[PDB]
Each structure stands twice: as structure tokens, then as C-alpha cells.
């Protein structure tokens, strides 16, 4: 089971991901990294602005299914 979280893919681009309250956070960067066409390394999900450790669970920082996260990928000049 599990409900969708809100991954804000960069800016102006948002993609709904399906994860459970156990999805880690780099693991979170991996799935979001899949739809972004980039590696979870460059990609980085931060919920509500709190830098979460890649070893914490989805219900750890308080993400929980449904959570506005901010993915960030070191963007070369456009």
C-alpha cells in the first residue's frame, strides 16, 4: 500500500511518486531520479526545507505519504 508524495521536480515540474512511510530518502532520490532522467546523487528531495538524511525513513522527518518535497539537481548553466 502507500499513498503518493508530492515531488516538486525542480521548479514548474511536479511528479507524483508512490511510496510507503518506509521509503528512505536517497531511495526517495532514486525514484524521483528515475522520472528526472538523472541519478539520485544529483537529485535531492528535501521535505518542507528540512535536509533529511538518506538513512531516515519517510515517516521519520514527518514526510508520510503525501508530503511536499523539493528535489534539487546541481543544474549546469541551463
mmCIF file of C-alpha atoms in Angstrom:
data_model
loop_
_atom_site.group_PDB
_atom_site.id
_atom_site.type_symbol
_atom_site.label_atom_id
_atom_site.label_comp_id
_atom_site.label_asym_id
_atom_site.label_seq_id
_atom_site.Cartn_x
_atom_site.Cartn_y
_atom_site.Cartn_z
ATOM 1 C CA UNK A 1 0.000 0.000 0.000
ATOM 2 C CA UNK A 2 1.160 3.614 0.441
ATOM 3 C CA UNK A 3 -0.104 6.990 -0.787
ATOM 4 C CA UNK A 4 1.562 9.362 -3.286
ATOM 5 C CA UNK A 5 4.007 12.017 -2.049
ATOM 6 C CA UNK A 6 4.380 15.344 -3.864
ATOM 7 C CA UNK A 7 7.812 15.530 -5.508
ATOM 8 C CA UNK A 8 8.423 19.018 -6.822
ATOM 9 C CA UNK A 9 10.724 18.117 -9.730
ATOM 10 C CA UNK A 10 12.895 21.247 -9.818
ATOM 11 C CA UNK A 11 10.589 24.232 -10.489
ATOM 12 C CA UNK A 12 7.376 24.292 -12.568
ATOM 13 C CA UNK A 13 7.624 20.485 -12.812
ATOM 14 C CA UNK A 14 5.944 18.270 -10.190
ATOM 15 C CA UNK A 15 5.572 14.476 -10.402
ATOM 16 C CA UNK A 16 3.555 12.283 -8.011
ATOM 17 C CA UNK A 17 5.527 9.320 -6.628
ATOM 18 C CA UNK A 18 4.039 6.292 -4.866
ATOM 19 C CA UNK A 19 5.963 5.469 -1.666
ATOM 20 C CA UNK A 20 5.219 3.980 1.751
ATOM 21 C CA UNK A 21 6.095 5.518 5.140
ATOM 22 C CA UNK A 22 9.279 3.394 4.978
ATOM 23 C CA UNK A 23 10.780 4.731 1.707
ATOM 24 C CA UNK A 24 14.201 6.017 2.775
ATOM 25 C CA UNK A 25 15.271 9.391 1.369
ATOM 26 C CA UNK A 26 18.087 8.641 -1.071
ATOM 27 C CA UNK A 27 15.892 5.777 -2.130
ATOM 28 C CA UNK A 28 13.438 8.642 -2.486
ATOM 29 C CA UNK A 29 16.047 10.442 -4.606
ATOM 30 C CA UNK A 30 16.369 7.259 -6.687
ATOM 31 C CA UNK A 31 12.691 7.008 -7.732
ATOM 32 C CA UNK A 32 12.472 10.766 -8.257
ATOM 33 C CA UNK A 33 15.814 10.415 -10.002
ATOM 34 C CA UNK A 34 14.166 7.871 -12.356
ATOM 35 C CA UNK A 35 11.493 10.265 -13.603
ATOM 36 C CA UNK A 36 14.021 13.141 -13.670
ATOM 37 C CA UNK A 37 16.307 11.248 -16.077
ATOM 38 C CA UNK A 38 19.113 11.766 -13.557
ATOM 39 C CA UNK A 39 20.868 9.892 -10.771
ATOM 40 C CA UNK A 40 19.618 10.239 -7.151
ATOM 41 C CA UNK A 41 23.085 11.633 -6.422
ATOM 42 C CA UNK A 42 22.431 14.900 -8.303
ATOM 43 C CA UNK A 43 18.750 14.681 -7.384
ATOM 44 C CA UNK A 44 17.875 15.515 -3.760
ATOM 45 C CA UNK A 45 14.491 15.545 -2.038
ATOM 46 C CA UNK A 46 14.062 17.819 0.983
ATOM 47 C CA UNK A 47 10.639 17.985 2.685
ATOM 48 C CA UNK A 48 9.391 21.372 3.937
ATOM 49 C CA UNK A 49 13.012 22.556 3.731
ATOM 50 C CA UNK A 50 14.418 20.083 6.283
ATOM 51 C CA UNK A 51 17.547 18.321 4.992
ATOM 52 C CA UNK A 52 16.761 14.651 5.672
ATOM 53 C CA UNK A 53 19.478 12.023 5.944
ATOM 54 C CA UNK A 54 19.396 9.316 3.262
ATOM 55 C CA UNK A 55 19.181 6.727 6.088
ATOM 56 C CA UNK A 56 15.965 8.004 7.729
ATOM 57 C CA UNK A 57 12.511 6.675 6.785
ATOM 58 C CA UNK A 58 9.662 8.555 5.081
ATOM 59 C CA UNK A 59 7.730 8.891 8.368
ATOM 60 C CA UNK A 60 10.934 9.988 10.123
ATOM 61 C CA UNK A 61 11.330 13.674 9.217
ATOM 62 C CA UNK A 62 7.500 13.662 9.086
ATOM 63 C CA UNK A 63 7.102 13.172 5.324
ATOM 64 C CA UNK A 64 4.422 10.473 5.484
ATOM 65 C CA UNK A 65 2.579 9.580 2.273
ATOM 66 C CA UNK A 66 1.605 12.958 0.799
ATOM 67 C CA UNK A 67 4.371 15.457 1.546
ATOM 68 C CA UNK A 68 5.650 18.404 -0.382
ATOM 69 C CA UNK A 69 9.304 17.726 -1.072
ATOM 70 C CA UNK A 70 11.827 19.776 -3.055
ATOM 71 C CA UNK A 71 14.071 17.829 -5.441
ATOM 72 C CA UNK A 72 17.348 19.566 -6.351
ATOM 73 C CA UNK A 73 19.816 18.554 -9.089
ATOM 74 C CA UNK A 74 23.051 20.610 -9.433
ATOM 75 C CA UNK A 75 21.959 22.202 -12.721
ATOM 76 C CA UNK A 76 24.692 23.239 -15.150
ATOM 77 C CA UNK A 77 24.007 26.730 -16.515
ATOM 78 C CA UNK A 78 20.647 25.696 -18.019
#
